[PDB]
């Protein structure tokens with residue numbers, strides 16, 4: 001069969017095969033709250049990674065892995081708007097939250113440069129785009145393919161629905177270097193899609209960690225970043 | 237594991253686990269040509285089904301199946317336009333091409349009515365929309381979710397690329413009755429998506445056959461309908 | 473992923489993805505009764521509705537496969553006939569004309585004809601020398617290749633009415649076919665392994681399934697398979 | 707699909723999703739040498755675990771997991787005999803080699819008692835059975851199901867073949883609490899089998915680590931303990 005394949009229909013408190021970084025944790029109702037949700041709403045940053053590294057490419061054979069992932073998340077804001085967003089990403093094996101990272105960078109970047117050493121590929125679901133604080137963002141809530149920088153190489157308008165469950169399917173096909181993001185809201189049939197070319201071998205190291213990250217830059221514009229389930233499979 | 241799961245990376249001439257109806261066949265280059273391609277072009281209709289029925293729902297337990305399928309196809313037209321389109325469908329087990337069917341109906345319908353007895357769910361990739369002959373179609377090449385009728389319940393503009401390979405992922409999630417179509421062109425990043433609500437239990441019988449169908453209504457406006465690979469999985 | 477993979481936790485009456493041959497059918501309790509239960513002589517086979525490509529003539533590749541199933545053989549007296557078998561045969565093959573229960577509806581004779589193109593793992597309950605001269609002197613598990621006279625057998629510690637779990641694996645690279653049987657009830661286990669070159673015996677496209685028979689109504693027993701998992705890959 | 711499923715056709719030097727304990731490592735030829743192989747030969751103990759914990763049972767729902775694993779190993783001895791053996795095991799998440807463990811205990815036990823706190827289930831392929839040093843062992847090379855003690859609850863004669871590759875399939879079926887070990891030698895058709903009843907919920911904690919361990923108690927009677935490939939899948 002395939003190299004790796006795991007599925008979580010729900011999460012359990014202190015799940016031992018998920019590494020929790022920052023304020024990420026799983027509530028008693030079985031949902032992964034990557035971003036903290038509490039009594040007085042507070043600023044927050046969190047990441048959750050699957051406990052075992054994944055070989056995304058082989059230097060011996062030259063082979064690159066194809067992978068697919070599916071997850072459902074909810075972003076519920078108190079007012080009609082919230083910050084900062086959520087992201088699915090691939091980073092160097094067992095990487096830590098960069099020193100001096102902000103919610104607007106989802107705990108993935110130290111700065112707004114496009115440093116080659118970052119070695120990060122992420123699909124962001126950006127809810128905040130204020131030019132004052134996030135000058136790199138377009139003028140709307142978006143879905144962006146990030147490659148070594150918080151300034152997405154390609155974005156698309158995200159028709160975010162407050163409090164509604166969104167189903168996402170991301171697929172990467174090694175032979176064509178095609179990364180496709182497929183988002184839909186079963187509630188009303190709203191759908192958004194985006195595809196970009198990315199050479200994993202050129203950006204990432206052989207061994208990577210996969211997971212979710214998110215942040216809340218301003219407690220006044222609070223919103224949740226809850227992932228309900230997660231399926232992942234890769235194959236060299 | 238899951239109830240069923242099959243994968244074809246390429247096809248073989250006279251593949252014994254695919255039922256060929258009409259002019260459908262697989263070339264020596266290993267591609268499923270649902271529609272006939274020849275020296276002097278001709279009118280054509282064809283369907284190809286996986287040889288074994290699939291239980292899409294259980295009358296005993298009440299359970300409904302969730303399924304996902306992925307395939308890549310190419311539609312290459314001689315001129316800058318072609319007819320008639322291609323479709324992925326679920327029909328009653330071992331059903332035959334309806335008597336008196338046309339290319340515009342992809343060999344799935346006898347008429348343009350919405351008869352409940354048709355028991356057909358299909359995702360069409362419609363290339364012809366002329367009002368003279370296809371009065372039910374919108375004013376552009378589209379992707380449509382068909383339920384018991386050639387007049388789609390929901391469509392979306394399909395940014396068809398002549399001769400380019402398109403990757404499609406269709407998922408049906410029983411719990412939310414959500415059918416999502418995800419199409420993308422690795423060549424230039426063009427992507428189209430559509431989602432609709434469909435209750436399989438209400439439309440289809442317990443046992444169904446899945447496959448592709450397509451047609452060429454006018455030999456003068458010829459185009460191919462080739463599927464390169466196919467992955468399918470269902471689970472009750 | 474793999475070329476094919478299916479799983480049946482239980483069966484349904486008139487399951488449309490199983491081809492029923494002979495007296496095979498599935499009861500309302502969801503069990504595949506390959507052999508008729510009511511009393512009478514019987515022969516039956518059940519195949520998965522779609523052919524499977526076991527090897528490619530273009531590339532030369534051979535498929536590795538694994539299957540798991542649980543069956544029960546309940547006899548009225550302390551003994552029964554005739555046995556059950558899991559097999560691979562030419563695509564959509566029919567029960568051979570003039571076949572007997574002792575041959576499980578897989579063979580026309582007791583010869584080793586190359587044209588039979590059949591590989592089967594039998595769970596033989598009858599071994600009387602008068603009628604089954606090819607069989608050893610005990611209930612056995614045998615690897616059959618083009619003949620009812622197994623190329624290799626092993627004593628089968630059959631337990632009347634108990635559920636047996638079986639796992640069969642074929643690893644193409646080493647041409648190794650292994651049968652793993654166990655009884656969760658009391659821990660009884662039997663195992664057997666043999667070398668078989670599928671490419672040499674079978675055609676490219678085959679049908680897989682179960683077959684069984686009851687040669688004498690007086691020594692009745694059931695041949696019920698409760699579940700079935702199968703997966704192959706080229 | 708299933709909760710977890712991974713497959714290694716070969717191993718890579720310093721594989722990042724395998725935790726190496728003791729002298730375990732993977733050679734350049736891609737084989738997991740759980741026990742050290744060098745010239746001059748030396749006493750050795752080693753363990754290799756999959757990097758991520760696995761939930762073997764849920765305290766909330768009461769559910770127990772069914773799992774299956776397949777691997778191929780080779781035990782090549784210099785003389786006509788070797789020590790000490792190899793083992794596949796399930797232990798508490800991220801457990802370490804017990805302080806004061808010996809090769810005869812495969813780096814799994816501190817003593818020869820049957821302490822309930824050990825929380826270990828292992829299938830051993832014991833090559834040494836000398837009564838002087840291993841008084842608990844039967845009078846032949848064996849396969850044993852160990853539950854919280856090096857004194858197996860059930861054994862069977864193991865017809866070990868020097869230097870030959872052995873294929874093993876272990877399955878645990880939660881509903882019947884049945885653990886079955888299926889070993890065979892493709893080389894000559896030699897096969898050994900053993901089955902026992904084990905209630906995982908009663909022995910192990912919810913989260914466990916799975917892997918291989920082995921030892922060489924006496925450098926004079928050296929032998930290798932190499933696993934060539936490993937497939938594992940579990941499901942709650």
Ligand SMILES: *[C@@H]1O[C@H](CO)[C@@H](O)[C@H](O)[C@H]1NC(C)=O
Nearest residue numbers: 096097098099100109110111
């Ligand atoms: C950004 O993060 C990296 C990695 O932790 C660190 O080396 C670098 O110093 C950080 N930048 C700043 C200004 O701290």
Ligand SMILES: *[C@@H]1O[C@H](CO)[C@@H](O)[C@H](O)[C@H]1NC(C)=O
Nearest residue numbers: 332333334335336345346347
């Ligand atoms: C449409 O197809 C159905 C099924 O083959 C058939 O019964 C019906 O008569 C057809 N309509 C016409 C006009 O033939």
Ligand SMILES: *[C@@H]1O[C@H](CO)[C@@H](O)[C@H](O)[C@H]1NC(C)=O
Nearest residue numbers: 566567568569570579580581
């Ligand atoms: C044995 O079965 C084959 C296949 O049906 C048939 O051709 C042959 O004639 C049978 N033998 C006899 C004696 O009928």
Ligand SMILES: *[C@@H]1O[C@H](CO)[C@@H](O)[C@H](O)[C@H]1NC(C)=O
Nearest residue numbers: 802803804805806815816817
């Ligand atoms: C046996 O191992 C356990 C766990 O490391 C340890 O607590 C115990 O002290 C060990 N026994 C001895 C004699 O060291």
Ligand SMILES: OC[C@H]1O[C@@H](O)[C@H](O)[C@@H](O)[C@H]1O
Nearest residue numbers: 553554573574598603687688
């Ligand atoms: O007595 C038992 C035997 O009865 C015969 O009629 C039959 O051909 C044999 O296969 C076996 O069933």
Ligand SMILES: OC[C@H]1O[C@@H](O)[C@H](O)[C@@H](O)[C@H]1O
Nearest residue numbers: 789790810839922923924927
């Ligand atoms: O001769 C082999 C034996 O050597 C002993 O020193 C050791 O305690 C035993 O476990 C075994 O390794």
Ligand SMILES: [Ca+2]
Nearest residue numbers: 126128129134
């Ligand atoms: Ca932002």
Ligand SMILES: [Ca+2]
Nearest residue numbers: 362364365370
């Ligand atoms: Ca049309």
Ligand SMILES: [Ca+2]
Nearest residue numbers: 596598599604
């Ligand atoms: Ca017999």
Ligand SMILES: [Ca+2]
Nearest residue numbers: 832834835840
């Ligand atoms: Ca020992």
Ligand SMILES: [Mn+2]
Nearest residue numbers: 126137144152
């Ligand atoms: Mn952004």
Ligand SMILES: [Mn+2]
Nearest residue numbers: 362373380388
């Ligand atoms: Mn249309």
Ligand SMILES: [Mn+2]
Nearest residue numbers: 596607614622
């Ligand atoms: Mn026999």
Ligand SMILES: [Mn+2]
Nearest residue numbers: 832843850858
């Ligand atoms: Mn022992």
